[PDB]
């Protein structure tokens, strides 16, 4: 719906840059209804699973901004988020063989910095962020 419209308007790689007005509109829409974000993750898995690395970066940034801002993606990324733990363990680490890793190295660095930020941003009881960061630092950063 409108979630998909905003996802298309933002993830488009023809203008691959962070736009604040669209992101604040998405934040306000997600705050208006929690069900906006539960399908948004499904949209983001579309963008993470897409061929273009810029779309993956855009969907990662959208997920991060919804988790840190909307207060509805927080209840997806810091509660009922084993999907998020597995996507963190599969994104930076090697994709499970035979399927190899398809993201770009700049996207790997961006994910590393996002994990380092989220270690302190929301870690009141979610320590698997830090555990995954340590595993990366000792196995496939």
């Amino acid at each position: 719906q409108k979630l998909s419209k905003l996802v298309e308007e933002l993830t488009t790689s023809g203008e691959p840059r962070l736009n604040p007005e669209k992101m604040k509109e998405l934040k306000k829409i997600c705050k208006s209804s929690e069900e906006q974000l539960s399908r948004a993750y499904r949209l983001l898995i579309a963008q993470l699973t897409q061929e273009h690395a810029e779309i993956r970066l855009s969907a990662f940034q959208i997920v991060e901004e919804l988790f840190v801002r909307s207060h509805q993606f927080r209840m997806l990324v810091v509660s009922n988020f084993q999907e998020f733990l597995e996507l963190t363990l599969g994104t930076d680490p090697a994709q499970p063989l035979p399927p190899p890793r398809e993201a770009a190295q700049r996207l790997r660095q961006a994910t590393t910095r996002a994990v380092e930020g989220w270690n302190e941003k929301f870690g009141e009881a979610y320590k698997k962020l830090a555990l995954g960061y340590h595993f990366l630092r000792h196995n496939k950063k």
Binding site: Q82, K127, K128, L131, F135, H138
Partner: protein, 365 residues
């Protein structure tokens, strides 16, 4: 439930009912407790955990980095949130610390004052818990995959040791005699387990896909060789009578000791009658293991129904032992899961994993 409290109170049901039924209900509700944590001390993956059989207060933990950590599992703080603090630790600086991965660690049954730990440095070290000094060291010519002390032997104090050698070594802690060997396997013994029922019955599993039960008193070889089919494919035993179609890297007697659960790298678990090694044909579906070393898994105790908690890649798969129905898969680890251990007092599960974490699973509500 209030029916259960009223039934207990009025004697309609034996209190055993409420205990066991509630214990089961608690097991089904196992969930990653973020209201409980275990202090991170291993630099490497946790290969083994052991909650002490008496009082279930302390846990040992053996790491791939060679350190043994000794945790206290009681919430001594008044908060509802606590971290199981590490009491002692055989650290990188201990003169007796293992040189390589600690592969097994075990409380001496009958007493918390002594525990034993075996490693890939080819040693089984006996420790005095209090002074935390080795009391004994058994050297093996080959790397130790697992050892096990009898949970039941008031009489003998043998440690069965499985190494990459094809032979099972019995180490008598009473006057130190590491000569006795059980012969009959052909490849590394990846798992050994004493019967919890019979004082001198030992089950040993090997990479040659065969599991043998021994009467170590006996001077005449294995009692039983577990056979997948029970005789449908029958051959003069030279290569047949394989428990699995891969390596058998895990053993666990059920609580009462009447059945044996084996997991092998054919991605199967089987349930065997420990008396005649007959296959009960419990299905269990597909159990992913590809562990190249021993796979430490446990059963529940004191519930209405018995459960088995098996590492399933990065998760703990919970199965009903006697029907095979998969209860659930507990998803909270990041890398493959190496060991899970069951706290029989409160239906709590601790699982170590290669990601240097020990996760507590406690029943919800």
């Amino acid at each position: 439930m209030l029916g259960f409290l009223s039934a207990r109170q009025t004697g309609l049901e034996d209190p055993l009912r409420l205990r066991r039924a509630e214990s089961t209900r608690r097991v089904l509700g196992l969930e990653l407790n973020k209201d409980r944590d275990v202090e991170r001390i291993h630099g490497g993956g946790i290969n083994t955990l052991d909650i002490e059989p008496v009082e279930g207060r302390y846990m040992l933990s053996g790491g791939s980095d060679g350190v043994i950590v000794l945790y206290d599992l009681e919430n001594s703080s008044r908060q509802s949130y606590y971290t199981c603090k590490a009491v002692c630790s055989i650290g990188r600086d201990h003169p007796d610390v293992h040189r390589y991965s600690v592969e097994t660690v075990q409380w001496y049954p009958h007493d918390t004052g002594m525990f034993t730990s075996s490693s890939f440095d080819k040693t089984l070290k006996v420790w005095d818990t209090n002074t935390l000094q080795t009391a004994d060291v058994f050297n093996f010519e080959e790397t130790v995959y697992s050892h096990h002390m009898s949970p039941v032997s008031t009489k003998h104090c043998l440690v069965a040791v499985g190494t990459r050698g094809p032979k099972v070594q019995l180490c008598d802690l009473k006057s130190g005699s590491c000569s006795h060997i059980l012969q009959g396997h052909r490849q590394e013994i990846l798992a050994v387990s004493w019967s919890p029922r019979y004082d001198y019955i030992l089950a040993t599993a090997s990479a040659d896909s065969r599991v043998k039960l021994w009467d170590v008193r006996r001077a005449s070889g294995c009692l039983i060789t577990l056979d997948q089919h029970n005789g449908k494919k029958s051959q003069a035993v030279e290569s047949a009578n394989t428990a699995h179609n891969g390596k058998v890297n895990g053993l666990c007697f059920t609580s009462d000791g009447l059945h044996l659960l084996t997991v092998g790298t054919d991605n199967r678990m089987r349930l065997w009658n420990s008396s005649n090694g007959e296959n009960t044909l419990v299905n269990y579906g597909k159990v992913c293991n590809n562990s190249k070393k021993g796979l430490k898994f446990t059963v529940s105790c004191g519930c209405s129904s018995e459960f088995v908690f098996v590492p399933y890649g990065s998760t703990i798969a919970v199965y009903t032992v006697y029907s095979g129905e998969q209860i659930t898969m507990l998803k909270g680890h990041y890398k493959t899961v190496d060991c899970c251990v069951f706290q029989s007092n409160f239906q709590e599960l601790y699982s170590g994993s290669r990601d240097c974490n020990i996760l507590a699973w406690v029943p919800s509500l």
